[PDB]
């Protein structure tokens, strides 16, 4: 199961 | 940018037996970037029906793929894997050895 996190722009 | 040339292994799924169906594999690994062309050859000719695994990579970020086809080893047939990649000036051909 994948993380439920939207990562910020680099 | 870092580029790495592919390692190449050509081999069968099961120990080869003349007249028994089997799978012919070509495992390419340790390459970067991911663009790569891989053919399985029967008597120097391209085999049409070839499948491959989904693109993945190792701890060092280098890519790996398995190419495979069903085949039946015979006495009159010589198999090989042909690979091209940006790191290679010409396609690299590796012949199948039943004990490698």
């Amino acid at each position: 199961r994948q993380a439920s996190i939207e990562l910020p722009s680099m | 940018m870092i580029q790495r040339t592919p390692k190449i292994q050509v081999y069968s799924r099961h120990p080869a037996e003349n007249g028994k169906s089997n799978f012919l594999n070509c495992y390419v690994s340790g390459f970067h970037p991911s663009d790569i062309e891989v053919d399985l050859l029967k008597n120097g000719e391209r085999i049409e029906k070839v499948e491959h695994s989904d693109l993945s990579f190792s701890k060092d970020w280098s890519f790996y793929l398995l190419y495979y086809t069903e085949f039946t080893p015979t006495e009159k047939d010589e198999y090989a894997c042909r690979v091209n990649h940006v790191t290679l000036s010409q396609p690299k051909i590796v012949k199948w050895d039943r004990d490698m």
Binding site: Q2, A3, E6, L7, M10 | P33, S34, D54, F63
Partner: protein, 274 residues
């Protein structure tokens, strides 16, 4: 023994040949269980192992939502990285991300990972403490500061120590018959005369799972590495692995050499001789 869950994501730009291609794969140990390919027919996260088919529609919808969202994030990242490295809009470039968790024999948390590469080299990685970032070069410090500001590491830590470990255990249970198996190697030795003067001894290990194995040669019971060849462990295509180790020996001296095989599926190591 020990287990892991890992996700691997690759995005490649191809300027003037459409928008980037994105591929995601998921593994438990050495077994792939999901894939997504942005250019493929289904436009969904797809199963690649039987035991994952036990998951219901909400799982497939959510995994599809998350992976498609991640593909969009990489598209943005590709443009930003080009700016950071003062590169033109013309060349192809590659972003990779890996994350996941390891557990021990007791299935408890050992370690977590979340790291990135640009064009074949390290870019940024979450340290083992799951609280701070290592920036690989000067350009990456700009990302480090943004991610520190966002406090993303706290969210990643919670997932890696929690959800990651629980879903890994879930899968290990649901796929017990295959994932928790140990297939001990089937072993044999071959001999070939390369000349009148030397012979090759090749020690084989076939049909094993998991991938981890040790093959070693000894001469007179002393470890030998000189004049040996050991190939990379390779997939058979049926879920098992293969490996061999060879040594070149003088003719008439074959009997001095022994091959030793170590694997999880072997209570005690195997000894092979010609």
């Amino acid at each position: 023994g020990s287990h892991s869950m890992r996700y691997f994501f690759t995005s490649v730009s191809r300027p003037g040949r459409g928008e980037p291609r994105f591929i995601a794969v998921g593994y438990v140990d050495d077994t792939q269980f999901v894939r997504f390919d942005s250019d493929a027919a289904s436009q969904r996260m797809e199963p690649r192992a039987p035991w994952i088919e036990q998951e219901g529609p909400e799982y497939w919808d959510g995994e599809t939502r998350k992976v498609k969202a991640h593909s969009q994030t990489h598209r943005v990242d590709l443009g930003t990285l080009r700016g950071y490295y003062n590169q033109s809009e013309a060349g192809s470039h590659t972003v990779q991300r890996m994350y996941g968790c390891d557990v021990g024999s007791d299935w408890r948390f050992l370690r977590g990972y979340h790291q990135y590469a640009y064009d074949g080299k390290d870019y940024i990685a979450l340290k083992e403490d799951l609280r701070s970032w290592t920036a690989a070069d000067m350009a990456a410090q700009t990302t480090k500061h943004k991610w520190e500001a966002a406090h993303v590491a706290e969210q990643l830590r919670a997932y890696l120590e929690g959800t990651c470990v629980e879903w890994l255990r879930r899968y290990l249970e649901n796929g017990k018959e295959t994932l928790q198996r140990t297939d001990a190697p089937k072993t044999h030795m071959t001999h070939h005369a390369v000349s009148d003067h030397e012979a090759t001894l090749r020690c084989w290990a076939l049909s094993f799972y998991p991938a981890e194995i040790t093959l070693t040669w000894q001469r007179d019971g002393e470890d030998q590495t000189q004049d040996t060849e050991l190939v990379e462990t390779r997939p058979a295509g049926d879920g098992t692995f293969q490996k061999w180790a060879a040594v070149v020996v003088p003719s008439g001296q074959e009997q001095r050499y022994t091959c030793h095989v170590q694997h999880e599926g072997l209570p005690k190591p195997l000894t092979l001789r010609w």
